[PDB]
């Protein structure tokens, strides 16, 4: 992540991010709603950072340093460029909504009152079709990627040295290759929990309550479609094993 956004989301909550004199100006229900919206954006920033570790540190490092057989890097990191484009665009919209809401003279004090419309747009139309297509493909290639990683780490010396080198720093402690893959697969099922809790504290404006209710329904429809479209691919599985599913 870039330093400006890391510092804007360094605090454990919105109530600790804003100036205490600004916090004091709001009612408790507003503080509760803003703390959950801040967690949605902060966790989205971290999710985009996970995808940047996968594309830039791992994938591009393997292409630039190792001599892997063709199809191997794509097998380890299926759909990563498409996933990065989807989530970097979504994060850009969330951060622009925060930036427009800042008080003049401040780089930290804001309130987001209109998140629902942004979530309806993300989870409907062509962007929802691309999220469904990409996650149905990625999640169906998840077992195959883990198995390919394990085989290369155990048999290829230069690959093992590369992985140990780039994952040595303490900032990569939670972000080995397999850990990144499961963080990405689990991201999509965090959205309902976060949206339902924002909705619980968004009853003050009826149009906002209605828009978050619509967004929650669209997110659950996307998850149901992705879940129904998954079938794990397996290297070496024969056609007979497939058509006898």
């Amino acid at each position: 992540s870039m330093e400006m956004d890391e510092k804007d989301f360094a605090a454990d909550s919105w109530s600790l991010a804003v100036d205490s004199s600004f916090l004091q100006q709001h009612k408790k229900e507003v503080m509760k709603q803003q703390d959950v919206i801040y967690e949605l954006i902060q966790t989205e920033l971290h999710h985009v950072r996970t995808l940047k570790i996968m594309t830039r540190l791992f994938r591009t490092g393997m292409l630039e340093e190792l001599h892997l057989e063709p199809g191997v890097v794509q097998g380890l990191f299926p759909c990563v460029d498409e996933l990065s484009d989807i989530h970097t665009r979504f994060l850009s919209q969330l951060l622009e909504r925060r930036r427009q809401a800042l008080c003049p003279g401040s780089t930290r004090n804001f309130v987001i009152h209109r998140l629902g419309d942004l979530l309806i747009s993300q989870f409907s139309g062509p962007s929802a079709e691309q999220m469904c297509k990409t996650y149905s493909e990625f999640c169906s290639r998840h077992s195959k990627a883990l198995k390919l990683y394990k085989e290369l780490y155990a048999r290829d010396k230069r690959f093992q040295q590369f992985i140990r080198k780039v994952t040595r720093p303490a900032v990569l402690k939670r972000h080995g290759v397999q850990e990144c893959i499961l963080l990405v697969t689990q991201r999509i099922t965090k959205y309902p929990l976060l949206i339902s809790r924002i909705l619980q504290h968004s009853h003050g404006i009826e149009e906002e309550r209605q828009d978050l209710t619509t967004a929650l329904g669209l997110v659950k429809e996307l998850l149901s479609n992705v879940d129904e479209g998954i079938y794990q691919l397996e290297k070496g599985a024969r056609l007979q094993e497939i058509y006898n599913r």
Binding site: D12, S13, S15, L16, D35, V36, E39, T43, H46, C139, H142, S143, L146, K173, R174, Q178, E179, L182, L183, T185, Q186, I188, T189, K190, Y191, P192, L193, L194, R197, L223, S224, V226, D227, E228, I230, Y231
Partner: protein, 179 residues
Amino acid sequence: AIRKKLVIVGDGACGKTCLLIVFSKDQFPEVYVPTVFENYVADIEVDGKQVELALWDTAGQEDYDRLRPLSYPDTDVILMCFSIDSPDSLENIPEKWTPEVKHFCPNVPIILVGNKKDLRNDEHTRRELAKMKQEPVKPEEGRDMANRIGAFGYMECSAKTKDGVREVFEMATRAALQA
């Protein structure tokens, strides 16, 4: 320090997310309790052995039968959670969660954990449950369920007070290290 993987499973009401949060911070959040848990790698030393224990939550995956199993590969220990304030969460252990974990995690030790033990003697909890002809889970009911499902052991804890939380994760680490 060898690396081991832990996954927590159970109904949404079991308090699994809160349990991972409290253990990973060694604190119940005083200002904001997070809605979600991403992952964490805890440095644990148990009985003189150093382990890096990766922690994962399954919250949000309960309704998605093809997404949820993607959390299970290479798991070394399962925490199977229920809440002591919810007999319904305990009833879902033997017939739903146990056959799933036995299929995707064969031979992996399971520790059955009774969460929210601080609510066993809470007046509001006893009044609410009595309306559905229920009462908080008794320790013998928890031990008997653990025995029945083939669990490695039975433990109780409270994420609210932190009592028992450290012991659960140190025991999970010991279970993960066994042959």
